[PDB]
Amino acid sequence: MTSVRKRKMNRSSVGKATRRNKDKQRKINIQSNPIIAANWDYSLTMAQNYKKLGLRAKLQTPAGGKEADLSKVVKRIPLTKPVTEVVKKLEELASRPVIRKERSQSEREEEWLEKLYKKHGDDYKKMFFDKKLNIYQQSEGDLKRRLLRWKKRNGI
Amino acid sequence: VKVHFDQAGKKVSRRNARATRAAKIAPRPLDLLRPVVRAPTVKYNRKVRAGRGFTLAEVKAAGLTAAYARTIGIAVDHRRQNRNQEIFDANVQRLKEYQSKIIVFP
Amino acid sequence: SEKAAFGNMCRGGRMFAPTKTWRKWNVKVNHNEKRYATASAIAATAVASLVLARGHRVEKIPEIPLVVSTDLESIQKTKEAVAALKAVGAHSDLLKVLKSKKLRAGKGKYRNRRWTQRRGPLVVYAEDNGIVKALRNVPGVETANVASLNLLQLAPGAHLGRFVIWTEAAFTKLDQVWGSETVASSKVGYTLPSHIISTSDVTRIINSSEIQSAIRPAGQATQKRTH
Amino acid sequence: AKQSLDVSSDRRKARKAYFTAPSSQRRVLLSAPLSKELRAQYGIKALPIRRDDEVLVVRGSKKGQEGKISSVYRLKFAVQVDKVTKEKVNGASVPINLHPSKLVITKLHLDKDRKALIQRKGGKLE
RNA sequence: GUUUGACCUCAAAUCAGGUAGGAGUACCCGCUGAAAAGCGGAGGAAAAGAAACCAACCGGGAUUGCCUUAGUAACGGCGAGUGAAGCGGCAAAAGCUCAAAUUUGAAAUCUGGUACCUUCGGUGCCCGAGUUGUAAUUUGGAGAGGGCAACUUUGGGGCCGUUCCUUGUCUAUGUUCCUUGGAACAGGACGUCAUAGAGGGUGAGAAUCCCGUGUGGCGAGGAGUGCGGUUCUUUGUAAAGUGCCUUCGAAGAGUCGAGUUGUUUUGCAGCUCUAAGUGGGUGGUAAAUUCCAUCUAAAGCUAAAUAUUGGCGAGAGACCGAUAGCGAACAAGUACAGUGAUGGAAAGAUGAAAAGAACUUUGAAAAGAGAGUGAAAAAGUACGUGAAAUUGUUGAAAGGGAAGGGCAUUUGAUCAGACAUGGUGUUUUGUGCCCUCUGCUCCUUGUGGGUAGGGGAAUCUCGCA
RNA sequence: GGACCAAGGAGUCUAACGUCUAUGCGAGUGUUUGGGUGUAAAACCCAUACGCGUAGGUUGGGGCCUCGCAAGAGGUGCACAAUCGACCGAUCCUGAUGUCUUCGGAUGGAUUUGAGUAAGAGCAUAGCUGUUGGGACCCUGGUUCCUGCCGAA
RNA sequence: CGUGGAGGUCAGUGACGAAGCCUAGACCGUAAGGUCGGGUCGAACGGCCUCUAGUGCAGAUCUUGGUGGUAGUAGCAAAUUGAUAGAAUAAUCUAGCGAAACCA
RNA sequence: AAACUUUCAACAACGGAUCUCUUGGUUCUCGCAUCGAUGAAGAACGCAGCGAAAUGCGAUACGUAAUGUGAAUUGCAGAAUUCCGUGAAUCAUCGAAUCUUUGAACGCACAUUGCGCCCCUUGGUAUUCCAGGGGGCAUGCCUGUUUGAGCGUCAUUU
Structure with missing residues (x-):
């Protein structure tokens, strides 16, 4: 506060461009999945909240000590003295099949296949050595694949 | 002369990073799937360690491609070489266990 | 400042010696020494002649160490928890703290x-259920999980025996936290440390029977002046 | 106590905020509590005072006096109420600069901005 | 053909569109360099960074930074002392792009202009650029051509939310009685709130007077693809991936290196010379006409972990409290000084409110005196408080060219000097926790504690009077 | 060396070894690079590494026991010291059984050796202090409270 | 013994007067010092157990500030539309202004 | 004896020490990344009803417009608010303008208030002449458009 700039900006009639950030940098929204956004708690931690989920937070070998957090009573050894839920929800969601579309055929090339289907029929060695309407000289079996896709699409 | 007065502070900031990054990576872990790799240097040759990445051939032995495996969060090193049997097999079992526990969204 | 006559x-x-x-x-x-200090503080909190020796208004409380049910943890409103401490009998300590607000004499x-x-009571909980928000507004009260047990909160000003209130589950949990001869420790390689003397009273040992058998007769306990 | 980090509790910062406050913030600072009757009227405790309304004095040496505010002297964080004056030895008159924390508003001067403000503060405005 | 035209080069444009400079410079990167200064260049970081690496192991695996290695190795008139690195643990993690063989069944590429459109752009048309090579595909971890078998996959918008930023607004409880005070925010009694008893203001220490504080709520305007729903379309023999088979299967040269010189402590630079392709680099190894290891130099980009006495903001302090703390709490880099480069002070507090002394009078004028305000001018814009050194007057004493203290005592002056006023025994009368009778109640349940009603001192007895 | 007076004004901090003392643990010890946690620069918990250390006799003799009323006598003997030993390493000779013609050390000597074996003591923190270096008490001169005890050359 | 600050405590003191100042006022301490009276004064401050230090001054021709004597002296631009005035003829006195050196 | 000197006390001076505050430093931590030829920083000159510094502004000059709030400002003077509002305010916010002369400083010059050139507009008798107003005109570099030039090269009887 002893630079000439800071003193002038202090004495100026502008006022400081003041923005407060330090409160809101601790809290974060998770932004990504609404399911985790539901089960997120903003209180436990990244670590405790992932543990309460059931998802493995860090992959492997944390430095330091985890909270063993006193789940059980451990008794001394005598030395022989003398006498899941949200996991299930995401598992359903990933298990949920998406509404997929079959990759269809284009009208010109299925018409081309339709020309081949009437010109040669079904046999492939004749249509492979056909010049007219096989000018791209398609592969022996690519012909089969496209014709079987066309037949399953149309014409049995 | 420098004193780490910010040692308490930076850790907080670092966990803020470990918070904030985690916010973007919300289901996924922060870290990738790293190999378990035995160390060099006879002082340390009994020690096993976290390695950088597995190999191409090992990920193929796991039954997937490394280009796809980077999307699954499996760290892959091409320039490493697999030369020990038990290292290879244990890391394959590690890959299989990682495959068992993931669920991938389409 | 670094560079900021010459004498x-x-x-x-x-100035002489620029403060760096x-x-x-x-x-x-x-770490064992710090844990030892905390253990001595916890053991001192039971006694309550020490708590009076520090200065607390605990003369009308039910017993020592004062243990309340775990239901105390489930209080989430200030007035209810203050009424609960009235029902305990630490009201006079709270009134002491409330009257004791003075202004600092220093430049500070x-x-x-x-x-x-x-400082007043210290409430020890096993688990928060809104209790730490409820007691936050009342002065002099400070809460602590059994896992932490802050020494600065335990023996403030290095004077042993602050007035400490326990919840029921926390008091059981203290066995988990420090171990015993029966429960292990829950701390890695830690043992509740031993005594060098078993009996805390020396005058009991001196006046017991058998030292009193083995010992020669005593003097007048002030010397008879001769000549 | 102070829970947000963005709130500060420095005495030096707080006084530098107080004495260098702009006037629009000052009329928020220059606030007076309503009467028990006006709280029974509108359901609201304190309000930013202006000059048109009527007030009573509840502290100070001129305690138990009342009047309409002559002018709000916002630059001195103060408020001149009419008819509460010191009469000098020339015979002239100068009002006591009162402070709205020591005042209790008796009769409000209601305006559309004021009625909407009472509405937004939860008032049961007639 | 003495003509005409392609180019190519070079000019010119008040042609169109862009861009460079300067300031600052804490951190960063280069260059220069003494007994640091300087120069140049950037950014929010920069640099470095995906091995021509480290190792010798059961090998590791971009860079960066921390701890350890370690004050070790090594160096050094092996003197002064100088002074690493591998590994390990951690933080952070991320990888990619060119240059080499043809798309030749069609330069498939892009700037610009213009016309429109849903404009960080799109479409169309037209000039150009470009084969002395712009696109697609391929960077060794290969890859490409095909073929086979299958599978597996599709892209682009919108909108509304969400997320982020910038804001706006709402969200408790005494001003209850008494004393003191100029002023209650002080003291006492009785309260209420509290996820709010942080802080500040209000005429003195204010949870409850005000602002806030705390908890939540409602908005507003943007940023945005981060994802979440809806909605509109998207195929064209389009693009890609995996296994097997077949045929191929091209990479950084004035560089590597060598000598010398300077410089550094081995690199770097200059000068001269200057390569290879089962190549080259680097290191161990030997039972030796050795074997083995490990990378691919001479092209490029890359977040994060990192530095930051600067900027923009915050939040704190076992810091200083006006000779301190910044030179500077104040109209401080100021007044001032220097020709200049530059140097560089002193200086905070009336009061709660100016209520800042109406009016009379002396007085050139300055200053007074009456008077008054104020709680206080023992606060008068010379102003909180107001020490010492030093000054003036009065009083006392001493001295006469006398200096100071120490002891001890007079004399003179002077001060202090009970809120002391009771105890023991006896006696009179009266009263009650005394006596008697009748209770109630708390537990620590006894060698207890509290408490009521009526009667009596006629007799006794205790305490009190 | 001095006109007076007020205020300011001079052994501070840090690093490396060293003694002493206190404290915790103990042949181990050391949380705080870092991670987890939190009421948030506090406290609390700690994985893997790392650091430093670890890896016979005689004479007495504190005591203790017995006896002795006591005085004393006898016995067992802490620490430590002296002796005589032993062994390891070295020392210089012996040079075998074997021996690749120069390999070998077997055995026996000899003195000393050594923070040697012959049954650990260290690590960490704090305090006070010693030496050295950072401006290092301040600028030859100066160098800030009292009392007690010890007190030279 | 004393000083600034810090933790604890005395439900310490305080506008019916804290702190500070003065005190030819008393008291306790061997002393370092401490306690009270009175006066002034106006808003904070102490005792105890501990922590911490920018912690104790007569000197350093120490630093800064204030005030002396020198001294009403030197002397009169020594700092102050234009210039010390007055008188001595327009060639010593009064008046006004007024130092410094140095100072167990 | 007075006067003078010394000492002490009283009151009054002088002085600013002490005490108490403090919109100031000082240090630490956290976040952010943002100056220019679309003219920076810096300088100069002015702007307020009555201003010296401080701040703010640029001849639209302690400001204009916009948005929000909702009655002020205040040393004096003076407007007001039709007040249930298109509304004071030295208010806040600020995204649209203005922005004097310089300054990387940019028409050429410069010890000049020297000398221009081009374009647009208006008027003064206006076809000439003059006046006014407005806007451009620095260097380097890149890409493109346009105009040339070269004894550079080549072609040139279907």
């Missing part, structure tokens, strides 16, 4: 340390 004796000159940052601020402590009054007052 320590001079007006406006540089790299003077030691934090002090390294052996205008260094954001303006007010000072005594």
Whole structure:
């Protein structure tokens, strides 16, 4: 506060461009999945909240000590003295099949296949050595694949 | 002369990073799937360690491609070489266990 | 400031010994030794002649160490928890703390340390259920999980025996936290440390029977002046 | 106590905020509590005072006096109420600069901005 | 053909569109360099960074930074002392792009202009650029051509939310009685709130007077693809991936290196010389006409972990409290000084409110005196408080060219000097926790504690009077 | 060396070894690079590494026991010291059984050796202090409270 | 013994007067010093157990500030539309202004 | 004896020490990344009803417009608010303008208030002449458009 700039900006009639950030940098929204956004708690931690989920937070070998957090009573050894839920929800969601579309055929090339289907029929060695309407000289079996896709699409 | 007065502070900031990054990576872990790799240097040759990445051939032995495996969060090193049997097999079992526990969204 | 005549004796000159940052601020402590200090503080909190010896208004409380049910943890409103401590009988300690608010005599009054007052009860919980918000507004009360048990909160001003209130589950959990001869420790390689003397009373040992058998007869306990 | 980090509790910062406050913030600072009757009227405790309304004095040496505010002297964090004056030895008159924390508003001067403000503060405005 | 035209080069444009400079410079990167200064260049970081690496192991695996290695190795009139690195643990993690063989069944590429459109752009048309090579595909971890078998996959918008930023607004409880005070925010009694008893203001220490504080709520305007729903379309023999088979299967040269010189402590630079392709680099290894290891130099980009006495903001302090703390709490880099480069002070507090002394009078004028305000001018814009050195007057004493203290005592002056006023025994009368009778109640349940009603001192007895 | 007076004004901090003392643990010890946690620069918990250390006799003799009323006598003997030993390493000779013609050390000597074996003591923190270096008490001169005890050359 | 600050405590003191100042006022301490009276004064401050230090001054021709004597002296631009005036003829006195050196 | 000197006390001076505050430093931590030829920083000159510094502004000059709030400002003077509002305010916010002369400083010059050139507009008798107003005109570099030039090269009888 002893630079000439800071003193002038202090004495100026502008006022400081003041923005407060330090409160809101601790809290974060998770932004990504609404399911985790539901089960997120903003209180436990990244670590405790992932543990309460059931998802493995860090992959492997944390430095330091985890909270063993006193789940059980451990008794001394005598030395022989003398006498899941949200996991299930995401598992359903990933298990949920998406509404997929079959990759269809284009009208010109299925018409081309339709020309081949009437010109040669079904046999492939004749249509492979056909010049007219096989000018791209398609592969022996690519012909089969496209014709079987066309037949399953149309014409049995 | 420098004193780490910010040692308490930076850790907080670092966990803020470990918070904030985690916010973007919300289901996924922060870290990738790293190999378990035995160390060099006879002082340390009994020690096993976290390695950088597995190999191409090992990920193929796991039954997937490394280009796809980077999307699954499996760290892959091409320039490493697999030369020990038990290292290879244990890391394959590690890959299989990682495959068992993931669920991938389409 | 670094560079900011030239004499320590001079007006406006540089001072003798410019105070530098790299003077030691934090002090390294052996971990067993720190745990030992906390253990002695916890053991001292039971006694309550020590708690009166520090200064607390605990003369009308049910017993020592004072243990309340775990339901105390489930209180989430200030007035209910204060009424609960009335029902305990630590009301006089709270009134002591509330009357004790004085202004700081130093210059540090205008260094954001303006007010000072005594310390009161310490509530120990196993688990928060809104209790720490409820007791936050009442002065002098400070809460602590059994896992932490802050020494500064335990023996403030290095005086042993602050007045400590326990919840029921926390009091059971203290066995988990420090272990015993039966329960292990829950701390890695820690043992509740031993005594060098078993009996705490020396005058009991001196006046027992058998030392009193083995010992020669005593003098007048003040010397008879001769000549 | 102070829970947000963005709130500060420095005495020096707080006084530098107080004495260098712009006037629009000052009329928020220059606030007076309503009467028990006006709280029974509108359901609201304190309000930013202006000059048109009527007030009573509840502290100070001129305690138990009342009047309409002559002018709000916002630059001195103060408020001149009419007819509460010191009469000098020339015979002239100068009002006591009162402070709205020591005042209790008796009769409000209601305006559309004022009625909407009472509405937004939860008032049961007639 | 003495003509005409392609180019190519070079000019010119008050042609169109862009861009460079300077300031600052804490951190960063280069260059220069003494007994640091300087120069140049950037950014929010920069640099470095995906091995021509480290190792010798059961090998590791971009860079960066921390701890350890370690004050070790090594160096050094092996003197002064100088002074690493591998590994390990951690933080952070991320990888990619060119240059080499043809798309030749069609330069498939892009700037610009213009016309429109849903404009960080799109479409169309037209000039150009470009084969002395712009696109697609391929960077060794290969890859490409095909073929086979299958599978597996599709892209682009919108909108509304969400997320982020910038804001706006709402969200408790005494001003209850008494004393003191100029002023209650002080003291006492009785309260209420509290996820709010941080802080500040209000005429003195204010949870409850005000602002806030705390908890939540409602908005507003943007940023945005981060994802979440809806909605509109998207195929064209389009693009890609995996296994097997077949045929191929091209990479950084004035560089590597060598000598010398300077410089550094081995690199770098200059000068001269200057390569290879089962190549080259680097290191161990030997039972030796050795074997083995490990990378691919001479092209490029890359977040994060990192530095930051600067900027923009915050939040704090076992810091200083006006000779301190910044030179500077104040109209401080000021007044001032210097020709200049530059140097560089002193200086905070009336009061709660100016209520800042109406009016009379002396007085050139300055200053007074009456008077008054104020709680206080023992606060009068010379102003909180107001020490010492030093000054003036009065009083006392001493001295006469006398200096100071120590002891001890007079004399003179002077001060202090009970809120002391009771105890023991006896006696009179009266009263009650005394006596008697009748209770109630708390537990620590006894060698207890509290408490009521009526009667009596006629007799006794205790305490009190 | 001095006109007076007021205020300011001179052994501070840090690093490396060293003694002493206190404290915790103990052949181990050391949380705080870092991670987890939190009421948030506090406290609390700690994985893997790392650091430093670890890896016979005689004479007495504190005591203790017995006896002795006591005085004393006898016995067992802490620490430590002296002796005589032993062994390891070295020392210089012996040079075998074997021996690749120069390999070998077997055995026996000899003195000393050594923070040697012959049954650990260290690590960490704090305090006070010693030496050295950072401006290092301040600028030859100066160098800030009292009392007690010890007190030279 | 004393000083600034810090933790605890005395439900310490305080506008019916804290702190500070003065005190030919008393008291306790061997002393360092401490306690009270009175006066002034106006808003904070102490005792105890601990922590911490920018912690104790007569000197350093120490630093800064204030005030002396020198001294009403030197002397009169020594700092102050234009210039010390007055008188001595327009060639010593009064008046006004007024130092410094130095100072167990 | 007075006067003078010394000492002490009283009151009054002088002085600013002490005490108490403090919109000031000082240090630490956290976040952010943002100056220019679309003219920076810096300088100069002015702007307020009555201003010296401080701040703010640029001849639209302690400001204009916009948005929000909702009655002020205040040393004096003076407007007001039709007040249930298109509304004071030295208010806040600020995204649209203005922005004097310089300054990387940019028409050429410069010890000049020297000398221009081009374009647009208006008027003064206006076809000539003059006046006014407005806007451009620095260097380097890149890409493109346009105009040339070269004894550079080549072609040139279907």
